[PDB]
Design an enzyme around this catalytic site. Structure first.
Site, short mmCIF file in Angstrom:
data_model
loop_
_atom_site.label_atom_id
_atom_site.label_comp_id
_atom_site.label_asym_id
_atom_site.label_seq_id
_atom_site.Cartn_x
_atom_site.Cartn_y
_atom_site.Cartn_z
N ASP A 248 0.85 -1.19 0.00
CA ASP A 248 0.00 0.00 0.00
C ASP A 248 0.89 1.24 0.00
OD1 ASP A 248 -1.79 2.10 0.50
OD2 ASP A 248 -2.96 0.97 1.97
N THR B 164 -3.07 2.11 -5.50
CA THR B 164 -2.59 3.47 -5.27
C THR B 164 -2.22 4.08 -6.61
OG1 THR B 164 -0.31 2.69 -4.82
CG2 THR B 164 -1.77 3.06 -2.92
N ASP C 139 -8.85 -1.08 4.72
CA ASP C 139 -9.06 -0.37 3.46
C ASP C 139 -10.35 -0.80 2.75
OD1 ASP C 139 -6.64 0.97 3.76
OD2 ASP C 139 -5.51 -0.47 2.54
#
Lengths: 489, 482, 492
Positions: free
Chosen positions: A53, A87, A355
């Site tokens: 991440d 991302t 998340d």
């Protein structure tokens, strides 16, 4: 001698360098075939950490003076808003800085150019009206609930062999959470023991403590006792606890600290299960769940406390022993439990659920999503190129640069895959130009393919926030030319 | 010593450096308000030289080891075919190298990008068709004959006060040229005399040589004799023919000189070879060798050869050629730095609009062509497959600089100018362009500025091939100043 | 911000150098002819230590900055499964790095190459199918119980003159242990004083502790007491004494073993009673012994009688050439047994400790797998011939990576020959011709200097050693190359 001073082009350079350094490391971590990264640092680090991440790694460390930490800090607010999938928001912001090289050629006023950000609002919303989006998940939904966006978040992560199954589980958890309540009472934990299922779902709250080897295995129509003070002439202490206990029928006792041995013998014979040193944070959530209680001295039983009587039992997960609280009357609060491969890759799941839970919550509220794998990015790029020339000119200088910023997103997706980035760009533009929204970058193929078969989708929510936010994060840095007059000395 | 070999970044760097150095000096030259520069060199030049024309200074000096001279050498062939007016082709090739630094990010193969050059060739043909050029200039023409492109070529030059009139004259010269025969036989000279017109048009060939004090002043029904071998038999062969004039490309022996005077024959000592070779085509020619050369071996035209006073000084004129394939141009000047400049301008004028009657096609000037082309090139990159597109789209924004340079020499802020320019071209009006006198955008056609279609087709291919030879090939480099 | 940031090529270089640095020292170790190698260091390092074991020296010290310690640490877990043989796993992992230079020339995503390890799994399991694998251990087994792989493990070792004999002994030990879940209670140490055997076999488990100078010399049909809690105004003390004596007597207690400090008062008591106790007995010895005896439950002084399980045969202190040691023997279970090594008294004696670790793990595996492959590199050349076909067979990116893995196998024949003392170049080609033909038995003969029949030699490698090493080498190499960051993360 004083404060940090940079003038004209030099001030621009510090910001410019920070954006390029971050983009190369982050590129390998994007969409369905990303790369795991391990980091090593001395002192107060004690070894290497591997994060898939991008947001988590940037927040943790301020390696050097060049500005980027504040830009990075901002991504977290986004995380609460929607945060992930893959991302990529940081990468787009970085791309706009490359443009400033051609700007010196413009030679007059860089802030006039800033109109590009005004333009960005117009360009950003062309993706927020145009495309094909999706027919949003109506509610609960039997099979459209998952094996889609959660899988994509996972795909960049290697553990997706066993893990895609876990991802599928997360939507079921959000369904109970769904409606007006927003986010509360979700903490989910993982263990060092392996199992094919790699995940167990709990109706109520999940802990990890055992009274002792002895004690009844299961309690039903359970009364729950929570004590602030520890259980830590002695016989009189024993008797007060038993007499109050028997009349109530007490099935479970939870104490946030060390517990004295005499009580333990008593609880076992009675048919009552007790918990030693239960963490305080777990206890507060439980109170909301059970209707709550007033935690006082041993007088604490009877009506000062409220108990929820559905099912409390302790079962073996597979390797580690855990205790299951379930059937809460309130229904507002629920718990999710995950299992895994057993290394570090598994701890990644600890990273993934936090998340995943929030994104899904937005999915019900948005009722809108877009195709993943960069399908969204190429279509918008075709539309934006047309726009720059059409606008009068001051507007046009600004508008065209923004449009070409979309172009390496396809490149970043493909580059991390292990395939030639330029070759990928050639084929991709043609499929989007034709009018097929479903078509996108297929990393597994090494070319392009049907995104929908994969089931990869991105929340509509991620696209609206990034477009407005990217302009603002980039604009502050570019808008100001020359920074002087500060240092403490 | 001897041969050299090059490595990754250094090889590219040698080519990269050459393009940037030349771009800045040529930059001031472009547009109506360009400025002159003066250069002095390392002992083989003799003095200070000032050349408004970019091509002339680069050809004369090979200052250093980096690859530039071959690129530079090519511009003159372009001048021959068409490329003249204002120098821009060299500038255009030079910024393509800047793109290469960006290309390092493009980690794949730079040669793949090279495929872009004939994609560019498609771009040249994409540009040609896609842009309204013109529909006028039928032939000869009452007013479209000029007061157009020559004026723009002149616009970049200060002289354009008295001088713009001279430019108009150049078209009359091409009018006599049109027909079957190609572009040949044009010679221009200047004189010391003040006049508002600052020029006169002369029907015949201009030469300035005289046999001596004695000899007939004028010759009639003249025969022309040309000898390859020097004078350093003649009367016998001469009398039968009826020779009126003798032209020799070299030193002439003194003894025959006495003979010619009594006979009544006018001879020319040390005539230049270039005039002579043209003359042979003109008079039907001659077989030039030893004194056997007279009679049948040689053919002589016979209208009139005479020495005439041109306003001031005495000159000799050859005229009345039977063939009709060759002519000559004479200009009279007030005298200044800009009048021998007419030598620069007439040579250029001849190639620009002789070509114009042949093309039957022209494009709007003042940068009207470049912005429109920029508008349609952007769509094309997207239209083409994407890696092809990456090279094609970079090319498209290259065109942007020309609009900026035109405005910059005008005296108006470049940022605002680019902005107002694009909107008018985007709309669909081809006539609209950059009006430097306005400082804004205006109607190019009212100005009367138009560019030959060939200058635009030819510049595109010349830039593509010249650019292609750089990035592709190693063997060069630069070191230190002076 | 002391974070270490590595950039593309530099990132390979730290690891690349680490692999090359370790490869040269380990290389001399392999084969029938090996180099002993000793290291000296300042600060809590009194004298030079000699390592004929690549694994032992690597674990003891983390000498330099570059990452390799974790790779090194991993080899020991391998040791538990199979370990030894000769130290080759580290060598092979390192050799893969050298062709990475070739990879820069390829100039595409390095991670694309990583597909070669998946390819390697195919190669790894073709180390299987390419062997007719002995046919039958038959469990226990008469003649071929050993004089095979253990001999090969020891061939590189200096002591192969006298020591090949003790290596032979090791299989007798595994036979006692059959119920082949490798080792429980197998503990053997080197002892001072010479003997021709250089090893002795004890039916029981050893030790090295004594209660005190006084006490009965020996005990018969001994019962064992194990206490978690130590034995650690006078009248109050006496009560503590009395509890220990009153119930110790009923049992007939012959020996007491306590892990930790022992209080002085009971010591007088034990001597008169006729009970032998052990002060500060080591914990590791105690439970393995417990598996042997029958496992007791260790609590407070209530621990005697039934809560304690004592096995009874013979417990005695026996003079062993040198010093004098305490021996436990005649265990009912039979599952766990002890081998006692002896030697002239050489640094090379310390070799036995290494050898022991090496002997225990391979032999246990040999009985369960009922499958094994020819040693001396016979397996490696054959596998190499097959992998070459694979490279040509697969299109594009896959062939390049698969081909590079294939040539890696070529170096092993070279290392085997190199330590021999014979010319490596001649050896490589002669080797390839015999394997290509189809003879599995044929392999590298180091004494010969050429290729010979491995089966006659008796050198064989366990089927497990080959399948696991190939998988392990892949993972060890992948952790570095696969990941291109190595930077940040930790507030400060």
């Amino acid at each position: 001698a004083g404060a940090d001073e940079e003038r004209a082009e030099t001030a621009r350079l510090s910001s410019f360098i920070g954006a390029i350094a971050i983009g190369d490391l982050v590129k390998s971590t994007l969409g369905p075939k990303g790369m795991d990264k391990i980091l090593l640092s001395s002192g107060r680090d004690a070894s290497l950490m591997v994060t898939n991440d991008g947001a988590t790694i940037l927040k943790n460390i301020g390696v050097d003076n060049p500005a980027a930490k504040v830009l990075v800090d901002m991504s977290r607010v986004q995380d609460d808003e929607v945060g992930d999938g893959t991302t990529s928001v940081t990468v787009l912001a970085a791309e706009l800085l490359r443009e400033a090289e051609s700007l010196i050629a413009k030679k007059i006023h860089p802030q006039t150019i800033i109109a590009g950000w005004r333009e960005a609002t117009k360009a950003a919303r062309q993706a927020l009206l145009n495309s094909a989006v999706d027919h949003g998940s109506d509610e609960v939904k039997f099979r459209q609930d998952l094996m889609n966006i959660a899988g994509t978040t996972l795909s960049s992560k290697l553990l997706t062999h066993h893990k895609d199954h876990f991802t599928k589980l997360a939507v079921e958890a959000v369904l109970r959470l769904k409606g007006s309540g927003n986010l509360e009472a979700i903490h989910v934990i993982k263990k060092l023991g392996g199992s094919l299922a790699d995940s167990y779902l709990d109706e109520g709250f999940l802990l990890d403590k055992k009274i002792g080897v002895n004690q009844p295995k299961r309690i039903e129509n359970a009364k729950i006792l929570i004590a602030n003070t520890g259980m830590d002439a002695e016989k009189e202490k024993m008797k007060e606890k038993v007499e109050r206990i028997l009349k109530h029928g007490i099935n479970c006792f939870i104490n946030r600290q060390l517990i004295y041995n005499y009580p333990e013998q008593l609880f076992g014979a009675a048919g009552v299960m007790a918990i030693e040193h239960a963490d305080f944070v777990g206890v507060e959530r439980l109170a909301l769940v059970t209707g709550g209680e007033i935690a006082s001295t041993f007088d604490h039983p009877e009506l000062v406390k409220l108990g929820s009587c559905k099912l409390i039992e302790e079962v073996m997960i597979g390797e580690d022993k855990l205790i299951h609280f379930s059937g809460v009357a309130l229904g507002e609060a629920c718990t999710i439990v995950l299992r895994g491969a057993t290394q570090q890759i598994l701890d990644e799941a600890e990273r993934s659920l936090h998340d995943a839970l929030c994104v899904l919550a937005q999915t019900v509220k948005d009722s809108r999503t877009v195709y993943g794998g960069g399908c969204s990015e190429m279509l918008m790029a075709h539309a934006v190129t047309q726009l720059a020339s059409r606008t009068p000119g001051k507007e046009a200088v600004a508008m065209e640069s923004y449009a070409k910023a979309l172009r390496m997103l396809p490149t970043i997706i493909a580059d991390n895959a292990g395939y030639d980035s330029a070759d990928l760009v050639a084929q991709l533009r043609a499929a989007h130009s034709e009018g097929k929204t479903t078509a996108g970058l297929d990393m597994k193929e090494g070319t392009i393919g049907d995104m929908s078969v994969l089931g990869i989708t991105e929340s509509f929510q991620v696209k609206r926030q990034v477009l407005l936010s990217a302009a603002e994060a980039a604009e502050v840095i570019l808008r100001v030319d020359n920074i002087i007059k500060a240092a403490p000395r």
